[PDB]
Write a protein that binds this ligand. Structure first.
Ligand SMILES: COC(=O)[C@H](Cc1cccc(C(=N)N)c1)NC(=O)CNS(=O)(=O)c1ccc(C)cc1
Ligand SMILES: [Ca+2]
Length: 223
């Protein structure tokens, strides 16, 4: 997260870190047994880390639980990142508490201009690299598709939205992928892609979660 702020320990209790020896992506807890992340974060041997603030220090509220199954969206396209969404089932249910908690799925989508909270342990620099230990947070609005497309020339699909600031300085970044975009109490986005980080006229691109809720619910019901 570039241009954000330190969230405060466990203030984003649905935020998970995906670990394969090291943090590599974010995720969001959606019930005690399931995490949602980006398909482009898929790998085998994922350990889900819940209750994290400092990812390099055991502070006392963590739960480390191995993935038992990962399910990449049936129509995920790795070239364009269309349908960049994945479900991860935990080998054992998380013990839910004030620091390890689910985020509600939307019943309807979020409109342009709606303010959201984006969070993660990604790079905090727009030029070069610096990776934080504690969770970072950013408030950012959803942009209209037309403004986003005209400013950026990005090719996006109806399964993506743009959020951030066209002027630059505030954005998600490498290492935030898979993590949450929460707007008005609902998980509306997953950190997916962009061009650099926090560059002018290059806002962040997010998987549009509202389009996937029926798939999420039926997948969870059957697995
Ligand atoms: C700094 O490193 C990068 O090049 C960015 C990081 C990144 C990741 C996620 C979000 C942002 C953001 N600024 N909001 C930035 N990667 C990428 O930006 C994308 N990875 S990518 O290069 O593999 C890629 C690019 C474009 C498509 C359609 C699909 C995949
Ligand atoms: Ca920790």
């Amino acid at each position: 997260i570039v241009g954000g702020y330190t969230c405060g320990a466990n203030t984003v209790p649905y935020q998970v870190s995906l670990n394969s020896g090291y943090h590599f992506c974010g995720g969001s807890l959606l019930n005690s047994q399931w995490v949602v992340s980006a398909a482009h974060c898929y790998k085998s041997g994922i350990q889900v880390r819940l209750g994290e603030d400092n990812i390099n220090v055991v502070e006392g509220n963590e739960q480390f639980i191995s993935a038992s199954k990962s399910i990449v969206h049936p129509s995920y396209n790795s070239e364009t990142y269309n349908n960049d969404i994945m479900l991860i089932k935990l080998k054992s249910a998380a013990s839910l508490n004030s620091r390890v908690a689910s985020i509600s799925l939307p019943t309807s989508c979020a409109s342009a201009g709606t303010q959201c909270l984006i969070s993660g342990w990604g790079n905090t620099k727009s030029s070069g690299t610096s990776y934080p230990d504690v969770l970072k947070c950013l408030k950012a609005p959803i942009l209209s598709d037309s403004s986003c497309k005209s400013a950026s020339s990005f090719i996006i699909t109806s399964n993506m939205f743009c959020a951030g600031y066209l002027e630059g300085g505030k954005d998600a970044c490498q290492g935030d992928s898979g993590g949450p975009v929460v707007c008005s109490g609902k998980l509306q986005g997953i950190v997916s892609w962009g061009s650099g980080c926090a560059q002018k006229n290059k806002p962040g691109i997010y998987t549009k979660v509202c389009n996937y809720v029926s798939w999420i619910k039926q997948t969870i019901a059957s697995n």
